[model samples]
Target: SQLMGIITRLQSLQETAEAANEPMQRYFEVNGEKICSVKYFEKNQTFELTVFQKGEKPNTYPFDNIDMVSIEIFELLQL
Candidate 1:
């Protein structure tokens, strides 16, 4: 329930999360490589999901809905 709790805290902080163009941030790992990083921008209601690859720069995928972000992240993790 790691992602679940984090998203809950993100929702709770939606109103006063520093409001400095920062996104609600979370990082994950299994062995030694970066897996996924999520950032939520309250002001814009945007979720930035950065996908990582071994020895390469990550590509960010942006979403305008929380459901979309969670769905995408969960699906991505299943890969």
Candidate 2:
């Protein structure tokens, strides 16, 4: 059951990726530049995102960041 749910969740994320201008998957980018990925930590009730641009190590952004939703995982709470 958990696997099925994860598959559904990934499907939802893939849909968001398809609607985006960039490549869709667990890893994607914004504006075709800032690379990032989404991970939902169910145990902590949070979403973990790793973002970076150019030659920098990934940066962790606050979930409250509006673009966090728009970039790759909008409607995250709905799922």
Candidate 3:
């Protein structure tokens, strides 16, 4: 069910939060210190993680970005 899947994903996210480093902790908790976005994509699997650090812009390696690609096979119907 949709709820079940969402719950599982939440658990995974919590695990990730627990393992995050100090910088990543700030990325999630502090406003304006979080990751910005991808500036441009030249080709497949190319993106950027622009983060604000110490009042300066820090550009993370484009290749370090984690891409989540999903394909929907079918839609759920309410019973």
Best-performing candidate as measured by TM-score: 1
Best to worst by TM-score, what's the order? 1, 2, 3
Better of 1 and 3 by TM-score: 1
How well is each residue in 1-79 modelled by candidate 3, as lDDT tens digits?
6545533443343344445421221112223333333232433333334444566657564432333210110011111
How far does residue 43 in candidate 3 sit from its true spot (Å)? 3.8
Tell me the lDDT of model 1 at 1: 82
lDDT of 2 by residue, 17-44 (tens): 4554333336553455435666543333
Alpha-carbon lDDT, every model: 0.70, 0.49, 0.33
Angstrom error at residue 27, model 2: 1.2
How far does residue 7 in candidate 3 sit from its true spot (Å)?
A: 17
RMSD of model 1, in Å? 3.1
Local distance difference test, candidate 3: 0.33
Error of 3 at 2 (Å): 14
Residue pairs with clashing backbones, model 2 = none
User: On a 0 to 100 scale, what is the lDDT of residue 24 in model 1?
Assistant: 59
